Amino acid sequence: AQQYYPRELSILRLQDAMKFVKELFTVCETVLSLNALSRSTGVPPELHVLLPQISSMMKRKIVQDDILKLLTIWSDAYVVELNSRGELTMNLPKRSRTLAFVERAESWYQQVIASKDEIMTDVPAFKINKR
Secondary structure (H helix, E strand, C coil): CCCCCHHHHHHHHHHHHHHHHHHHHHHHHHHHHHHCCCCCCCCCCCHHHHHHHHHHHHCCCCCHHHHHHHHHHCCCCCEEEECCCCCEEEECCCCCHHHHHHHHHHHHHHHHHHCCCCCCCCCCCCCCCCC
């Protein structure tokens, strides 16, 4: 076109992905914080239990891969634990987190579009290995 060629179009796609993971982080923050209060151990239910809550707040069906995008931006954002059956459980780490995430999200976005190759259109899911 005039202003936007394939590379620029990919950047625009990525910006929507940035907007997505930023909102998703905030939603995970409210859900995990609230659910971590329900039990004496301070440990929330498995992630698959909390996904309907996360989905309703996001007004869209959120899956585990969406959640893992957050760790790509901030690896120490949450603590990841795999149980006996391999079911994923996420939890807040032991001590503003929202501001910290946005800064890293911005910095991550900067480094992606900075170099002149091919631009990814979405945040890749963080890779989790077996315990």
